[PDB]
């Protein structure tokens, strides 16, 4: 069984005080706190084994190159990719999606084609496709939402056709906590020869993820949401696709040869898309984060978080004039507004009690617009959050409602 | 005065053993070791103040946003930019140059124009321009080299004309240690209305850099070469230029608004070019690295390194059949080959003695080709290297020459 007290003791930030009160960090969906196992792994690398990593001749460089490729292997096993060489290190989910849209998009999406996104997508999974569609003259289609925060799947027959090149879809909504039916949607997309990119930035920390079972063509996620360092993400691409992708004009690609007369050639994928000095510190920390999470067990984490979520939704029923957004079976986040008060004011009061939530449009303005609100509040309930922190959130909202209503 | 023993005691890697022998790290031009002040600043941030940073409502987020903007201010003072808002955080020098070539290049370089690079450029300051020139149908012109590793300045009249849009030039060669006459070249470029991008990745750790005095239009450098963390670089752009640059299609740009019907708008520069979650860990560490280097004083560092370089070049005269490449007044690096032996073999023997040098083409294949060699060895002499490590290098080359000659 999972022991939240043993886990919390690994996270030094959770001791912190904010406004003279004990921190209740409910904003892990924006970024997760990191255990000392992650922080110290990165520091230890800088302290005892740091070097540049392009299979340099000397020992530190060779050993650091091997550390980085072992992390690539560990990450591929974490998401059950067939091969470590199907994983590209990227700056984060945002850059990973941009890479696909520029390298794969520019040579597979032509004038008259269409791309399907959903109305709940984070901006990082909208804007690259908007721009691509403008470049090549294709059409961006949108799966609409239901009031309960799920996709209107009945609209799919009107969106998928033979010119559909790509479905770009979120695994788990960063606002609603909706988990989308990826395996079925991927079957539909592949029946039309469409690829699927899955934005998995909110999924990989909540339960096991198996890209072979899903059969998705691309999958992205962010280190810093996975209790890991900033500046590092993972992009998975099916080997047959990845080995056809051209070099990344926009972000830089690693060369095989450079000639002023004869031009330039490029090294094989993965590494083709990792130009310049990689973020070795971040890669080391990401590896430690994958080990930490695997050691707790994602199924134990999921069971604890689901129980915590069920407790919170039950307790929140006693908050007057609370509006919740999203389905009952949400993962990780609770999106809400309190009566007619602006989310910004609710979040400031909650911060005044030492409760960290996020306010605003959460990089999902089309989602905001669907619900005809400018902003919502969002509380994250991660593996190190407690029933007691849920009770502070509930009491906090009750007090805010009396003081301001 | 500078005390190399007091400085070395700040760097924990320098205690390390390699192949059972004490490390002599002479590969700082590939990446620098980091002091504990840098390592611990990053760890301390993760331990006590970590949060997401997009001016979030709650305290940790607000305080982390302010930490990151103070580092931007500190970096702008470090290079004497007029305004902190002229600095963009980037993944590294490679990504910074790609950003300029894609955002500024695509809307200022048209068919029939030309760009001037030099023959000693690192690949990161060649390939983006090669691709841009192919996109828009412009011409890539090259300032050639002299045998001593300096630019043939007499060729400039034949390269600069009214269609010259940009000069992209290295401040200090990562292979030869040549320092280029930037201020004079920038005057010439501006007489034709050409902009200048300076690749300063090898300059910022060796002496003060003043972008107002230089009057360059762009300037880039890498954190990890500045005794700082990986995954972070600085791109400086003159405010009038930067505020005109369009969003970065290839790498992602931060939105002001996203609408599925009305399209997308973008936030003001700096931040326009920092999409997704920034590398907050790396930014914090970079700030500590700038403080550490400022506390030693760049002029003291320069005086120590110059003395160390002069000692090494004097000692190396006693190595039979040593070929050196570059001018006598080189900064930081010594590029060399030993008789007819492949650089790879020399580097392996040196590594066997615990001496870390770099071998290969050093991401400067046109430079290699100018000298009609496939590879060279390169020893870096940074601020924490000693006369004794120079003596190990010299003795090592002498032994290699007897064993293999
Ligand atoms: C946060 C998030 C992103 C963006 O991730 P970055 O690490 O900031 O690049 C994209 N999609 C979802 C669903 C997210 O939650
Ligand atoms: C190392 C270096 C680069 C590339 O820097 P990255 O940090 O790897 O992106 C570019 N130019 C010069 C002169 C360099 O030494
Ligand atoms: Cl956004
Ligand atoms: Cl290269």
Numbering used by the authors:
A (entry chain A), B (entry chain A): 2 to 406
Q: What sentences appear in the manuscript?
A:
SufS is a pyridoxal-5′-phosphate–dependent enzyme that uses cysteine to generate alanine and an active-site persulfide (C364-S-S-). The SufS persulfide is protected from external oxidants/reductants and requires the transpersulfurase, SufE, to accept the persulfide to complete the SufS catalytic cycle. The β-latch contains four key components: the α6 helix, a glycine-rich loop, a β-hairpin, and a cis-proline. R92 and E96 (E. coli numbering) form cross-dimer electrostatic interactions with the α6 helix of the adjacent monomer, and N99 forms hydrogen bonds to the backbone amide and carbonyl of G251 in the glycine-rich loop.
We generated variants of SufS with either alanine or aspartate at position N99 and solved the crystal structures of the resulting proteins. Alteration of N99 results in significant, but localized, perturbations in components of the β-latch structural element. The structure of N99A SufS has continuous electron density for the β-latch; however, the glycine-rich loop and β-hairpin are shifted, exposing the SufS active site to solvent. In contrast to N99D, the N99A SufS structure does not show disruption of the cross-dimer interactions between R92 and E96. In the N99A SufS structure density for the glycine-rich loop and the β-hairpin is seen, suggesting they are less dynamic and are still capable of physically blocking the active site from solvent. However, the glycine-rich loop is in an altered conformation compared with the WT SufS structure. This altered conformation shifts the position of the S254 amide away from the active site by over 8 Å. The backbone amide of S254 has been shown to interact with the terminal sulfur of the C364 persulfide in the outward-facing position. Loss of this interaction could affect the stability of the persulfide intermediate to nucleophilic attack.
